[PDB]
Amino acid sequence: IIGGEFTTIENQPWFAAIYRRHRGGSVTYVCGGSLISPCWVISATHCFIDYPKKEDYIVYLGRSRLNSNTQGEMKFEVENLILHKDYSADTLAHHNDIALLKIRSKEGRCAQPSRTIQTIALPSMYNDPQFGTSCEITGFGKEQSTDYLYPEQLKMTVVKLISHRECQQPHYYGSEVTTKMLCAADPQWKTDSCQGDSGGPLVCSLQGRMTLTGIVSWGRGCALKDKPGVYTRVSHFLPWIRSHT
């Protein structure tokens, strides 16, 4: 997250931190995710496509820090890694960028809700907030493009949803952004998601309910003028999510 605010997991209790174990025992951070039911975390296919081996991955819930323990945190393995069959990537745009991770503890249990671990509501069909709506994003991704390490503390920021018409302008993304994608950015281009935030939530208060409207997917650079963050439009994928869970 470029700019924005340091946060803690109680403020973002659906947030899932996903890491990959390497041969030799080193563990690196991959991407964010969101808990949509006790056994299911939703993320982005692009985070796993090149290493699609579910045994490699560790998922934490209730975690506020990248490489230290948070009280109440819970550690999981991936029982099922489900990537979208029609995923593809162009030069900038990623398509069908959505993935589900069925999580289980070493004892075979799913998440136990607490003050720091909660599910986030899915949106209803064809129901997204109006452009101009302010929504939040959360993640452990880069704070500046010159960063070679991720921040140790979780971050969040607030961005505004941008219309499809605006996002398809020639100086934005033209026809590379589709109706299955949502653009969001800061009017001053000072805050944005960045590399490492992918897979994480774009949450909007929708009819008084905190809703998983988007999943961090792609964008040109980070907090670059006329280059919004692009998010998987979760509301388009409800049948896929329902069939695979």
Partner: peptide, 14 residues
């Protein structure tokens, strides 16, 4: 991998 932005996390060269 590559450090070319959102979309490119955890990628493999070749």
């Amino acid at each position: 991998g590559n450090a070319l932005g959102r979309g490119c996390e955890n990628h493999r060269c070749l």
